[PDB]
Amino acid sequence: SHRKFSCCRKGNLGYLPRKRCTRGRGRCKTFPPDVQGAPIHLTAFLGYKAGCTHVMRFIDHRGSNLHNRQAIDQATIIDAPPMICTAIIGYAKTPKGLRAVTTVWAAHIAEPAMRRFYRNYFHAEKTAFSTYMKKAADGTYIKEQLGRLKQHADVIRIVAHTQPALTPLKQKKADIMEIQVNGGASVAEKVDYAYALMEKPISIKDVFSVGAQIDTISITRGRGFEGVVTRWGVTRLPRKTRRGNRKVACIGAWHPANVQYTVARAGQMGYFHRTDTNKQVFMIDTAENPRCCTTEFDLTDKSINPVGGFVNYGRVQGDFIMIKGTCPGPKRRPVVMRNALLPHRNCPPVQLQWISTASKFGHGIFETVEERRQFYAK
Amino acid sequence: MVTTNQCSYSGRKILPGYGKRMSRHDKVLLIFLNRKASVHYLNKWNPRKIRWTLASRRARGKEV
Amino acid sequence: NLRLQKRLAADVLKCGKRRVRFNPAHEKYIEQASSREAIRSLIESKIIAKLDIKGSSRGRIRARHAAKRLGRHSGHGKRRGTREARMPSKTLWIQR
RNA sequence: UACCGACCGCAGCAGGACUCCGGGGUCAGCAGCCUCUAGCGCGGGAGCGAACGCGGCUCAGGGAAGUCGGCAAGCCGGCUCCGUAACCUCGGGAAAAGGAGUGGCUCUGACGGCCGGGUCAGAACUGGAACGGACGCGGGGAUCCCGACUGUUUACUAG
RNA sequence: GCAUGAAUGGACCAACGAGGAUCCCACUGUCCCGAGCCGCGCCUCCGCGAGCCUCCAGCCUCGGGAACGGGCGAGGGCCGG
RNA sequence: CGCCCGGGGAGACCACCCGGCGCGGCGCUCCUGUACGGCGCAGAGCCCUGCGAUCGCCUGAGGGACGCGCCUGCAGAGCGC
Ligand SMILES: [K+]
Ligand SMILES: [K+]
Ligand SMILES: [K+]
Ligand SMILES: [Mg+2]
Ligand SMILES: [Mg+2]
Ligand SMILES: [Mg+2]
Ligand SMILES: [Mg+2]
Ligand SMILES: [Mg+2]
Ligand SMILES: [Mg+2]
Ligand SMILES: [Mg+2]
Ligand SMILES: [Mg+2]
Ligand SMILES: [Mg+2]
Ligand SMILES: [Mg+2]
Ligand SMILES: [Mg+2]
Ligand SMILES: [Mg+2]
Ligand SMILES: [Mg+2]
Ligand SMILES: [Mg+2]
Ligand SMILES: [Mg+2]
Ligand SMILES: [Mg+2]
Ligand SMILES: [Mg+2]
Ligand SMILES: [Mg+2]
Ligand code: NA
Ligand code: NA
Ligand code: NA
Ligand code: NA
C-alpha cells in the first residue's frame, strides 16, 4: 500500500558512487569555451589552500537592506607561487572527439618535473628525456614541430608545473597541469603566443582579476568508513529499538527481490572530487609587500601572515589570492582555479576596509606583535 | 579598525566581529570579549578579585 | 622452588608468609635447608628475617581530635545524625 | 581423628550449599568509601584506535510538541530552625504543601567530681556569592475505580 | 436501565496499595535534530579451535505452467578469486 | 615501464599521497590564572617573648602545548625483484 505522508528522498543521486577519488588531484574536466577575436589569455592556475579570515567591506547594492552600510564576510586565502611553462600540446577536432596531434617539450627541464617522472629520485637511473635533450639543442626541431601544430591543430594548451620549494610543503616533486589558451584570431596567433612564454614563469596576476568569478576544484576532507545517519542523513530510530537505532529500518519491498541502488548504505565518506562555482575574487597581492593588507583605516603595516602563523600551514612566501567564501578540502590540499562558466549576474563591487590578522591559534586580540609587546610591558 | 569596543567585564579591547553583546532589562548593553568573560559575569564573580582583569589591576596599583 | 622453606620460616617466626623475606645472595644455602632446625640456623645468621608490621600512622587523627576538643569541625554542616541519636534525652535525665 | 567448600548441577560450570571468631578512619550506623592483620594477581597475549553494538558522560534555545501510554532518564534527598490545608473511624492526614541556614579559623558561655567529658548554644574574621563540596540519600499535588488493613499465590511468560 | 439492585449482599467510606485511570507544578535528548567523547567487544597478528544446515546449483524481465521459476520458451546482462 | 620501509592532508586490513625520517631542544604564539620560598607596623584574636585561617610584595607569575620559525646535539638513502 501507499506511504501515508509526503516526503522526499534523502541525498543527491547525481553524486554516485561515493568512493575514494582515484585521480591524483583535482582535475579540470572542461575549460571555458573559446570565442574568436577576444584578447588572448590563459584560463586556469594551480595553488594551495592556506587559511580563512575576516574582512569588513562596504556594500553598494541598490534595492537591498545592505545598500549603504558595512558587512563582515568570510574569506579564504590560496597560496599561488609562480608556474613554469614547459611544453605545448595541440588537439584536432575529429568525428571521434578531441585527439592530440603532438606535444613539443622545451630544451631544458627543471628538477621538480624530472622528479615527477620517477618514484624514488635518489635511486632511480636518470634517463628521462636523455636522448630528446640532445636532439632539441638547436631550435630547428622545435620550429618543425610547431609548424606541424600550426598546420594541423584546433585547440592549443600549454603544460606548466609548480615550484614546491617556495611553499612550506614536504613534497619535492611538482604538479604538472595543462592550461588552455583562449582568444586570438587564428591558431597561428595562439601558437606564437604559447611559444613566447616557454621556459618562463607565469604569475597569477596575469590570469585572474579582482572582482571576477572563478570555480574551484579539489578533493574534500576524508572521514573513512561511516554509517547511514552521517553518510546520508536519515532519521534515527526511537530509543526502544533492539540492536541499536542508527540505521534504515526497511531496505526494500518483497518485490523486486533485490536491493535497489537508491537505498542508503554504510561505506566511505569524504575524500571526493568536488567543484564549487561562482566565487568572487577579493584581492591579488604578494607577501613580499609590507603594506599587503593595510587599508585606509589602518596605521601600522600588516602583511598577510597572521600573528603566530597559519595554523597547520607554513608561512606564505610570495603571491596569493583571496576569494569570498569557502572551497573544498583541508589546508595544504592542491586547488585548481578556473574562470567561471556560468557566472552570477548581480554581484556588488569589492571594497575592502579592514582585514583581520589576529592569531587563529587560540583566541588572539592583537593584530601585530608590536602591539602585543607594547601591551604586556615587554 | 579604529572603532573598537571595550569588554565590560575585563576592560580589554575587542576587534570587529569577535564577541557577543547582551541587553539587560534595565536597557543597559554589556559587551563581552569571549565565553570565559560572559561566564564570569553570569556567575556573579567580582572582577575586582580576578587578577588578570583591569578592575583588579587598578585596585592593586599596577594600572593607573 | 622455595615454597617449602617459606612455610617453615613462617611457622618458626610466627608470622604470615607475606612477611618472611630472604637474602637473594645465599639462595643455595636456603635451597639445601629442608627441616625446621636448618631454618633456625639460617635465621640465626640473618639469611632469613621478618619485617615489622606496617602499622598505620595516627598523626592526623590525633591533631584532628585535639582541634575537635577545642571546638572545631562541629557545625551544622559536619553533623549528620539527629541530636537524639548524638545524645539521648534519657541519658541526660538519668544523670540529672 | 589426614585434608577440602576437592560437595551437587554430565566439567577445574558467573548457579546452589548450615554455623563460629569480627581491628582503624569518616559516620546515627555491623550502610557506602579508603585501610592495618592475613591472603593473593585465576578460558593466554600483542597491535590499531573505522562502522556498529554493550556499559557510561556532556550538550545552545525550547520543555512531553515524542509515544498506546512521561517507558527511559532527569529532579528531590543528611541535619537544624520556621510553617503546615481539606477531610477523618479523632488514632491520622504529615517529611503535607513550602521557606532559610550548613566550610575554615580565632574565641565566649552552659552542664560533673572531690581532674574527666563530650555535647549544646552565641560572636568576630576570612575564602570565584563556597561549604550534607566525594559517598550515602523522598519529586510533589488535585481526583475517579477496585480491594478495608499486615499477609498469600501460578518454582520456568499472569503478584 | 438491550441485560442495575440489596449477606448470589446494596450504598458510603478515613488509613493503606511494586493495583487500573485523568489532569497540574517541577524536571529533563522523549522530541524539534542531532553532535562530541570514554572503556570493552568488533577489526589486524601469534597460539587454540567448534555448531546449525546441505537434491544439485546459486544474475534478471516477460510468457505459459499445480494459476507468484535458478533450471522450461523468448529476450537482456555477466572474466576468475 | 617495481617493491619492501617511514610519515600523513589518507586509513578496518589493504589501498592512496608524499619521503635524508625523526628524537631532543630554543624562540614565537596562546591556555590557565599569579608558582615554591622569603619578607611584611598586614591579620580577627588568644593562656601572648609565641600560636593563627587568610592578605600584600618579588609575580600577567609559574606550569603546559599535538600550531608556527630555526638547529647550538644525536641522526637519517638499506634486503627480495
Ligand atoms: K508519497
Ligand atoms: K586430629
Ligand atoms: K498491590
Ligand atoms: Mg525490546
Ligand atoms: Mg583556531
Ligand atoms: Mg585435623
Ligand atoms: Mg548425578
Ligand atoms: Mg561454584
Ligand atoms: Mg502528545
Ligand atoms: Mg503524535
Ligand atoms: Mg520510570
Ligand atoms: Mg489488599
Ligand atoms: Mg502487601
Ligand atoms: Mg511464573
Ligand atoms: Mg511476574
Ligand atoms: Mg437483573
Ligand atoms: Mg434478600
Ligand atoms: Mg449482581
Ligand atoms: Mg528455486
Ligand atoms: Mg532456457
Ligand atoms: Mg586524517
Ligand atoms: Na523519652
Ligand atoms: Na561497610
Ligand atoms: Na522474477
Ligand atoms: Na604563595
Coordinates of N, CA and C in Angstrom, one line a residue, chain A residues 258-356:
Chain A
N258 N 15.4 -7.9 -4.9 CA 16.8 -7.4 -4.9 C 16.8 -6.2 -4.0
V259 N 18.0 -5.6 -3.8 CA 18.2 -4.3 -3.2 C 18.5 -3.3 -4.3
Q260 N 17.7 -2.2 -4.2 CA 17.9 -1.2 -5.2 C 19.1 -0.2 -4.9
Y261 N 19.7 0.3 -5.9 CA 20.8 1.2 -5.8 C 20.4 2.6 -5.1
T262 N 19.1 2.9 -5.0 CA 18.6 4.1 -4.4 C 18.5 4.1 -2.9
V263 N 18.9 3.0 -2.3 CA 18.7 2.8 -0.8 C 20.0 3.1 -0.1
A264 N 20.0 3.8 1.0 CA 21.1 4.2 1.7 C 21.9 3.1 2.5
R265 N 23.2 3.1 2.3 CA 24.0 2.0 3.0 C 25.3 2.7 3.5
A266 N 26.0 2.0 4.4 CA 27.2 2.4 5.0 C 28.4 2.2 4.1
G267 N 29.4 3.1 4.3 CA 30.6 3.0 3.4 C 31.5 4.2 3.6
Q268 N 32.3 4.4 2.6 CA 33.3 5.5 2.7 C 32.6 6.9 2.6
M269 N 33.1 7.8 3.4 CA 32.7 9.2 3.4 C 33.8 10.1 3.4
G270 N 33.7 11.1 2.5 CA 34.8 12.1 2.3 C 35.8 11.6 1.3
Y271 N 36.7 12.6 1.0 CA 37.8 12.4 0.0 C 37.1 12.2 -1.4
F272 N 36.3 13.1 -1.8 CA 35.6 13.1 -3.0 C 36.1 14.2 -3.9
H273 N 36.0 14.0 -5.2 CA 36.3 15.0 -6.2 C 35.1 16.0 -6.3
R274 N 35.2 17.2 -6.0 CA 34.1 18.2 -6.0 C 34.6 19.5 -6.6
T275 N 33.6 20.3 -7.0 CA 33.9 21.6 -7.6 C 32.8 22.6 -7.1
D276 N 33.3 23.7 -6.5 CA 32.4 24.8 -6.1 C 32.6 25.9 -7.1
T277 N 31.5 26.6 -7.5 CA 31.4 27.5 -8.5 C 31.0 28.9 -8.0
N278 N 31.4 29.9 -8.8 CA 31.0 31.3 -8.7 C 31.5 31.9 -7.4
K279 N 32.8 31.9 -7.2 CA 33.4 32.6 -6.1 C 34.1 33.8 -6.5
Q280 N 33.9 34.9 -5.8 CA 34.4 36.2 -6.2 C 35.8 36.5 -5.7
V281 N 36.6 37.1 -6.5 CA 38.0 37.4 -6.1 C 38.0 38.7 -5.4
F282 N 38.7 38.8 -4.2 CA 38.8 39.9 -3.4 C 40.1 40.7 -3.5
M283 N 41.2 40.0 -3.7 CA 42.5 40.7 -3.7 C 43.6 39.7 -4.3
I284 N 44.5 40.3 -5.1 CA 45.6 39.5 -5.6 C 46.8 40.3 -5.3
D285 N 47.7 39.8 -4.4 CA 48.9 40.5 -4.0 C 50.0 39.5 -3.7
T286 N 51.1 40.0 -3.1 CA 52.2 39.2 -2.7 C 52.6 39.5 -1.3
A287 N 53.1 38.5 -0.6 CA 53.6 38.6 0.8 C 54.9 39.4 0.9
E288 N 55.5 39.7 -0.2 CA 56.7 40.5 -0.2 C 56.4 42.0 -0.1
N289 N 55.2 42.4 -0.1 CA 54.8 43.8 0.1 C 54.4 44.0 1.5
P290 N 55.2 44.9 2.2 CA 54.9 45.1 3.7 C 53.5 45.7 3.9
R291 N 52.9 46.5 3.0 CA 51.6 47.0 3.2 C 50.6 46.1 2.5
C292 N 50.8 44.8 2.6 CA 50.0 43.9 1.8 C 48.5 44.0 2.2
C293 N 48.2 44.1 3.5 CA 46.8 44.1 4.0 C 46.4 45.4 4.7
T294 N 47.1 46.5 4.5 CA 46.8 47.7 5.1 C 45.8 48.5 4.2
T295 N 44.8 49.1 4.9 CA 43.8 49.9 4.2 C 43.8 51.3 4.7
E296 N 42.8 52.1 4.3 CA 42.7 53.5 4.6 C 42.4 53.7 6.1
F297 N 41.9 52.7 6.8 CA 41.5 52.9 8.2 C 42.5 52.3 9.1
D298 N 43.7 51.9 8.6 CA 44.8 51.3 9.4 C 46.0 52.2 9.5
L299 N 46.9 51.8 10.4 CA 48.1 52.6 10.6 C 49.3 51.8 10.4
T300 N 49.7 50.9 11.4 CA 50.9 50.1 11.2 C 50.8 49.1 10.1
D301 N 51.9 48.8 9.5 CA 51.9 47.9 8.3 C 51.5 46.5 8.8
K302 N 50.6 45.9 8.1 CA 50.3 44.5 8.3 C 50.3 43.7 7.0
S303 N 50.9 42.5 7.0 CA 51.0 41.6 5.9 C 50.0 40.5 6.0
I304 N 50.0 39.6 5.1 CA 49.0 38.5 5.0 C 49.2 37.6 6.2
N305 N 50.4 37.2 6.5 CA 50.7 36.2 7.5 C 50.2 36.6 8.9
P306 N 49.3 35.8 9.6 CA 48.8 36.2 10.8 C 49.8 36.1 12.0
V307 N 49.4 36.6 13.1 CA 50.2 36.5 14.3 C 50.2 35.1 14.8
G308 N 51.4 34.5 14.9 CA 51.5 33.1 15.3 C 51.6 32.1 14.1
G309 N 51.3 32.6 12.9 CA 51.4 31.7 11.7 C 50.0 31.1 11.3
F310 N 50.0 30.7 10.1 CA 48.8 30.0 9.6 C 48.8 28.6 10.3
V311 N 47.7 28.3 10.9 CA 47.6 27.0 11.7 C 47.6 25.9 10.7
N312 N 48.4 24.9 11.0 CA 48.6 23.7 10.1 C 48.9 24.1 8.7
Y313 N 49.7 25.1 8.5 CA 50.2 25.5 7.2 C 51.4 26.4 7.5
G314 N 52.5 26.2 6.7 CA 53.6 27.1 6.9 C 53.3 28.6 6.6
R315 N 54.3 29.4 6.5 CA 54.1 30.8 6.2 C 54.1 31.0 4.7
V316 N 53.3 32.0 4.2 CA 53.2 32.3 2.8 C 54.4 33.2 2.4
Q317 N 55.1 32.8 1.4 CA 56.3 33.4 0.9 C 56.2 34.5 -0.2
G318 N 55.2 34.3 -1.0 CA 55.0 35.2 -2.2 C 53.6 35.5 -2.6
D319 N 53.3 35.2 -3.8 CA 52.0 35.6 -4.3 C 50.8 34.8 -3.8
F320 N 49.6 35.4 -3.7 CA 48.5 34.7 -3.2 C 47.2 35.4 -3.8
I321 N 46.1 34.8 -3.6 CA 44.8 35.3 -4.0 C 43.8 35.1 -2.9
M322 N 42.8 36.0 -2.8 CA 41.8 36.0 -1.8 C 40.4 35.9 -2.4
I323 N 39.6 34.9 -2.0 CA 38.3 34.7 -2.6 C 37.3 34.8 -1.5
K324 N 36.0 35.1 -1.9 CA 34.9 35.2 -1.0 C 34.3 33.8 -0.7
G325 N 34.2 33.4 0.5 CA 33.5 32.2 0.9 C 34.5 31.0 1.2
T326 N 34.1 29.8 0.8 CA 34.8 28.6 1.1 C 35.1 27.8 -0.1
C327 N 36.0 26.9 0.0 CA 36.3 25.9 -1.0 C 36.5 24.5 -0.4
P328 N 36.4 23.5 -1.2 CA 36.6 22.1 -0.7 C 38.0 21.8 -0.3
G329 N 38.1 20.9 0.7 CA 39.4 20.4 1.1 C 39.9 21.0 2.4
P330 N 40.9 20.3 3.0 CA 41.6 20.9 4.1 C 42.8 21.8 3.7
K331 N 43.6 22.2 4.7 CA 44.8 23.0 4.4 C 45.9 22.2 3.8
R332 N 46.6 22.8 2.8 CA 47.7 22.2 2.0 C 47.2 21.3 0.9
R333 N 45.9 21.2 0.7 CA 45.4 20.4 -0.4 C 45.5 21.2 -1.7
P334 N 46.0 20.6 -2.8 CA 46.1 21.4 -4.1 C 44.7 21.8 -4.6
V335 N 44.6 23.0 -5.1 CA 43.4 23.5 -5.6 C 43.6 24.1 -7.0
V336 N 42.7 23.8 -7.9 CA 42.8 24.3 -9.3 C 41.7 25.4 -9.4
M337 N 42.2 26.5 -9.9 CA 41.3 27.7 -10.1 C 41.0 27.8 -11.6
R338 N 39.8 28.3 -11.9 CA 39.3 28.3 -13.3 C 38.3 29.4 -13.4
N339 N 38.2 30.0 -14.6 CA 37.2 31.1 -14.9 C 35.9 30.5 -14.8
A340 N 34.9 31.2 -14.3 CA 33.5 30.7 -14.1 C 32.9 30.5 -15.5
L341 N 32.2 29.4 -15.6 CA 31.5 29.1 -16.9 C 30.1 29.8 -16.9
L342 N 29.4 29.8 -15.8 CA 28.1 30.5 -15.8 C 28.0 31.4 -14.6
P343 N 28.7 32.6 -14.7 CA 28.8 33.5 -13.6 C 27.5 34.0 -13.1
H344 N 27.4 34.4 -11.8 CA 26.3 35.1 -11.3 C 26.2 36.6 -11.8
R345 N 25.0 37.0 -12.1 CA 24.9 38.3 -12.8 C 25.1 39.5 -12.0
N346 N 24.4 39.5 -10.8 CA 24.3 40.7 -10.0 C 25.2 40.6 -8.8
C347 N 26.5 41.0 -8.9 CA 27.4 41.0 -7.8 C 27.9 42.4 -7.5
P348 N 27.8 42.9 -6.3 CA 28.3 44.2 -6.0 C 29.8 44.3 -6.0
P349 N 30.4 45.4 -6.3 CA 31.8 45.5 -6.4 C 32.5 45.4 -5.0
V350 N 33.7 45.0 -5.1 CA 34.5 44.7 -3.9 C 35.1 46.0 -3.4
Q351 N 35.0 46.2 -2.1 CA 35.5 47.5 -1.4 C 36.0 47.1 0.0
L352 N 37.2 46.6 0.1 CA 37.7 46.2 1.4 C 38.0 47.4 2.3
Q353 N 37.8 47.3 3.6 CA 38.1 48.4 4.6 C 39.0 47.9 5.7
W354 N 39.0 46.6 6.0 CA 39.8 46.1 7.1 C 39.9 44.6 7.0
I355 N 41.1 44.1 7.3 CA 41.3 42.6 7.2 C 41.9 42.2 8.5
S356 N 41.3 41.1 9.0 CA 41.7 40.6 10.3 C 43.0 39.7 10.3

